[model samples]
Target: GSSGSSGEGYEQDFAVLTAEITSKIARVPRLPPDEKKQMVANVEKQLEEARELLEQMDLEVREIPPQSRGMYSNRMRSYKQEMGKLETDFKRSRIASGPSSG
Candidate 1:
């Protein structure tokens, strides 16, 4: 009944995940502090946009096919978790605050 009803939302969620993956791959180890912040901000903006689009799509899809809405969300969560680990590694590699020559 409630499954396969929200195709558009799921589609947009997929799109958002796609965007985040792309952005993360492009910036992960290459971004400096300012650039990293900018990249993260941009990704955050896209994520918000994706969420809005997903809601709109969900509303539209509910009228046609009722489907599970958690799949895309779950997948994105997993991917983001991986990305979070990547972010931690990137931070560890990039920022060196230890005293050496300061």
Candidate 2:
């Protein structure tokens, strides 16, 4: 049985955010050049939102009793790490495209 707090439904919140962010990220690569750039921007916005949610999740995880924190903390760390990796990939995609035409 889970030992930590129920996290106030944060797991559901995270799952929804993850699905939205993943959907946007997946669409970016399939779009046309101009559309891809726009989609990337959209994905960036989604990432920012996801990052904020993750920060909240981290705080919640930290509040859990240490003995029961292991799973929650690990999940939070993994989520943050994944976000960082996705952000890096997005930045590289933008850089590769060079400056946008006016």
Candidate 3:
């Protein structure tokens, strides 16, 4: 099932992000424990990529012509903060979870 809407430009951004993650994972899928570490690294990298994308989008929204900004700027700012927190939490989880389970 679809994971719900992700605002305006997310489809393009997410596609690029997913491609990077898939490429990274594909590079080292046969190495067992080492591969797990690489996968975690890839996940973290993807999260960072997404966070950066959202930050850029947020800036774009903020810089929209003043008339449009009046309608959406506050909402965009709030959403950006939420995304930032989510990105931070994902980073923390990646670090705390470490590379391998066994």
Choose the strongest candidate by TM-score: 2
- Tens digit of per-residue lDDT, candidate 3, span 32-94: 566657666766778677777666766676677887767356756655565565555444444
Question: Tell me, what's the RMSD of every candidate?
Answer: 9.7, 7.7, 9.3
lDDT of 1 by residue, 1-102 (tens): 565653433563555565564556356446767766666566555555555554555455456532654465565456455445544544443443332243
- The window of 10 residues in a row where model 3 has the poorest summed lDDT is 22-31
Write the candidate numbers in order of decreasing TM-score. Answer: 2, 1, 3
- Model 2 C-alpha RMSD to native: 7.7
Q: Which of the two candidates, 1 or 2, achieves a greater TM-score against the reference?
A: 2
TM-score of 3: 0.43
Candidate 2 segments whose C-alpha is farther than 4 A from its true place: 1-8, 19-23, 95-102
| Model 3 segments more than 4 A misplaced | 1-36, 95-102
lDDT of each: 0.52, 0.71, 0.58
Which of candidates 1 and 3 reaches a greater TM-score? 1
lDDT score of residue 66 within candidate 3: 82
Instruction: Show the colliding residue pairs in model 1.
Output: 3-66, 3-67, 4-65, 4-66, 4-67, 5-65, 5-66, 5-67
